[PDB]
């Protein structure tokens, strides 16, 4: 029972491909030839954060756009105040090398993970004042790439074993186990309706999963390098993926095909982080050319250049209200652009 | 500008001073990345340098300098994505089982992929040919001609001091420099050879930070 299943899979792939090429009525790149873009965006760093020691690898925002959590490679979760430029929280991690950190939607819990294969969930509203270890989600056989909080009791995680998981804070065991991918997942991104989430693997495979059952709905295999970044649209209908080919690809969930292709000739480096704005107009991406790019989601042209950092841009994130954008590189410097 | 704002600024300054105190001891130590396949003697070198989780850190101080050795415990054989977290480290100790000739080609391929990595162009890879006693026993008492045809035309150098595997490794290394060394499963020299290499490696950093090289 090998050749028949292979030929059936090939026939289904051909069917999906012809359906996608038939549903391609008109690309957005040629339709947006009439809308007037904003032009040239010049962002200036309002406040600077020069307290980190090792390479900053991840960051996230909470409910209010004032607290900014960030993770460093020396096992440090530093939560800064974006307005007053002060250090709010400092959490010494037992695992030095980390790659992910998130903030609960209520502003009470934080997450961390990495090469330790154990996701540590810390609580900030403890009566002991200091930050203590609250939850230790273990059971994976791969490095933790990204993690995002769905609510005050559940959290989705992506491991290096090509499998994503959904853990429950109350239980602490494998609550939802999704089907394994071909490549290892590198990033995660949740939807505003906390029902669906799209994740890109190490190979050219971006799969959409639900929060109730472990079944995949859409799979995008259109790429040419390793995807390292992903983000969700504020409306929950599109998502942009960044890979090592310096060209971002914006797909949608309503048609299951490629909509926008952000590409340029003078950029051959990799992509680390991708994040949308509040309205979804200015798409901010982090390239390995010591600079950050801000493209237009409809024009797909050069709109904003951020040459403030001096090392490889590692992570970036826009607040829930789009008031400011945080960016962290390997120079242990957090910059808050506006 | 109120009293609570001043207290928050004072707490931020205290956290900054704590981070600087941590950085002070963080700069005074070195960080090494231990890599190797399953056939290598990585566990032997771990249990020799004593003077669930996909990472394991070993803290040992010799010659008044600490070395934090990070080794993958429960991770896959792929080292393409999680390798970027080991940048700006002191050295990458790559262990190779030179005794088994059947699994030596994959070891050479892994060494070539690590040396020619995208982000490891500024990190020095130190070779450790483990199981020297078994390597000597398999020669004085498996043939290399059955695996490497270039062994018949290669002989021992006359200008050396009493080399095929080392030559095959330095051919890819020279094409940061490598440091091939020979050690056994009971030899306690691994605690010193590192100090014999890093003292030079960091020296090269002193030639790059001070703009001397």
């Amino acid at each position, epitope marked *: 029972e090998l050749d028949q299943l292979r030929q059936e899979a090939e026939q289904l792939k051909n069917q999906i491909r012809d359906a996608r090429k038939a549903c391609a009525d008109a690309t957005l790149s040629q339709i947006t030839n009439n809308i007037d873009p904003v032009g040239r965006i010049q962002m200036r760093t309002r406040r600077t954060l020069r307290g980190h020691l090792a390479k900053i690898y991840a960051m996230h925002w909470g409910t209010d756009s*004032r*607290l900014l959590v960030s993770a460093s490679q020396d096992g440090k979760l530093i939560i800064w*105040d974006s307005y*007053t430029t*002060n250090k*709010v*929280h400092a959490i010494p991690l037992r695992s030095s090398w980390v790659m992910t950190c998130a903030y609960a939607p209520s*502003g009470n819990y934080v997450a961390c993970g990495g090469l330790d294969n154990i996701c540590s969930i810390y609580n*900030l*509203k403890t*009566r*002991e*004042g*200091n930050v203590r270890v609250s939850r230790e989600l273990a059971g994976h056989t791969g490095y933790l790439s990204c993690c995002r909080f769905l609510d005050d009791n559940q959290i989705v995680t992506s491991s290096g074993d090509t499998t994503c998981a959904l853990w429950d804070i109350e239980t602490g065991q494998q609550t939802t186990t999704f089907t394994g991918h071909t490549g290892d997942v590198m990033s995660l991104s949740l939807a505003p309706d906390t029902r669906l989430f799209v994740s890109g693997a190490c190979d050219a495979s971006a799969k959409l999963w639900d929060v109730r059952e472990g079944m995949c709905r859409q799979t995008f295999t259109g790429h040419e390098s390793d995807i390292n970044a992903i983000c969700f649209f504020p409306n929950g209908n599109a998502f942009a993926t960044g890979s090592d080919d310096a060209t971002c690809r914006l797909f949608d969930l309503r048609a299951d095909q490629e909509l926008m292709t952000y590409s340029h000739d003078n950029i051959i480096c990799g992509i680390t982080s991708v994040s949308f704005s509040k309205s979804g107009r200015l798409l901010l991406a982090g390239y390995d050319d010591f600079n950050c790019n801000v493209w237009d989601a409809l024009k797909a042209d050069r709109a904003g250049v951020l040459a403030g950092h001096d090392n490889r841009v590692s992570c970036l994130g826009v607040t829930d209200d789009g008031m400011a954008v945080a960016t962290g590189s390997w120079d242990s410097f957090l910059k808050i652009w506006n | *500008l*109120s*009293a*609570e*704002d*001043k*207290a*928050a600024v*004072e*707490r931020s300054k*205290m956290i900054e001073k704590q981070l600087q105190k941590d950085k002070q001891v963080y700069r005074r130590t070195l960080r090494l990345l231990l890599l190797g396949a399953d056939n290598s003697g990585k566990s032997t070198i771990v249990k020799q340098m004593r003077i669930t989780s996909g990472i394991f850190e070993t803290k040992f101080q010799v010659d008044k300098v600490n070395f934090h050795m990070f080794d993958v415990g429960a991770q896959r054989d792929e080292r393409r994505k999680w390798i970027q977290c080991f940048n700006d480290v002191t050295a990458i100790i790559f262990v190779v089982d030179s005794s088994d000739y059947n699994r030596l080609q994959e070891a050479l391929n892994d060494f070539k992929s690590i040396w020619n990595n995208r982000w490891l162009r500024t990190i020095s890879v130190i070779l450790f040919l483990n199981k020297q006693d078994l390597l000597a026993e398999k020669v004085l008492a498996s043939k290399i001609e059955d695996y490497f045809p270039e062994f018949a035309r290669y002989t021992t150098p006359e200008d050396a001091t009493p080399y095929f595997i080392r030559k095959e490794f330095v051919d890819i290394s020279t094409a940061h420099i490598c440091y091939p060394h020979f050690t056994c499963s009971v030899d306690t020299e691994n605690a010193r050879r590192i100090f014999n290499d890093c003292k030079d490696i960091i020296l090269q950093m002193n030639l790059r930070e001070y703009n001397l090289v």
Partner: single-chain antibody
């Protein structure tokens, strides 16, 4: 979370008294500590404040320089030395913990307090001091300050403390409207930068006591006259 105070009793004026406070349940080195006195049949009165690591130490305008306060982190202890006591220092002293950051609840937990017997600042003028109301109905306690507490940062400093007979005061709302922890949602705060109001939807048997108001705009911490609810 527990604060054990010791060093109370009777003393003669002119001597010296060293009160001790031991913390058990949290890291004492990362908590700002406030010593606050309360006279019998009177209101609260802040005495001294110390930050983490003994960086900034502030005293009240009436006891500035005469009293001293120190802390020991390796043993989690707080010492308060008072010399040349007058006829007013005979009161009940309490130790309060508070961390200062965005989202924190300062003055959340109060110590047990000890009694000691002997032998400009933004004052809080409470227009209401005795509002008898049966439990189960909504009550409104109003207060007025001599200066606008609404700082330019956007945070209004308005702390409420409910002191029950025989129990230390407990924090209800630390900001103008941000409810604290360990307190039911029945308490709500509102008003402008000058006149503040605390509304309770329903009262219970354990919802009796004096309601003190405290401002934290400047370093001189002054309390109100005290508004208690009778039955």
């Amino acid at each position: 979370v527990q604060l054990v105070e010791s060093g109370g009793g009777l003393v003669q004026p002119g001597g010296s008294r060293k009160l001790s406070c031991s913390a058990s349940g949290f890291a004492f080195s990362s908590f700002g500590m406030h010593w606050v006195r309360q006279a019998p049949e009177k209101g609260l009165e802040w005495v001294a404040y110390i930050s983490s690591g003994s960086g900034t130490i502030y005293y009240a305008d009436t006891v500035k320089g005469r009293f001293t306060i120190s802390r020991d982190d390796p043993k989690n202890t707080l010492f308060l030395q008072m010399t040349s006591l007058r006829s007013e220092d005979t009161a009940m002293y309490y130790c309060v913990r508070s961390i200062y950051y965005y989202g924190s609840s300062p003055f959340d937990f109060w110590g047990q307090g000890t009694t000691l017997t002997v032998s400009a600042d933004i004052v809080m003028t409470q227009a209401t001091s005795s509002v008898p109301v049966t439990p189960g109905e909504s009550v409104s306690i109003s207060c007025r300050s001599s200066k606008s507490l609404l700082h330019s940062n956007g945070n209004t400093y308005l702390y409420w403390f409910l002191q029950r007979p025989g129990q230390s005061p407990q924090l209800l709302i630390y900001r103008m409207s941000n409810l604290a922890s360990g307190v039911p949602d029945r308490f709500s705060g509102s008003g402008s930068g000058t006149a503040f109001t605390l509304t309770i939807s329903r009262l219970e048997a354990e919802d009796v006591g004096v309601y003190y108001c405290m401002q934290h705009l400047e370093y001189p911490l002054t309390f109100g006259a005290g508004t208690k609810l009778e039955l």
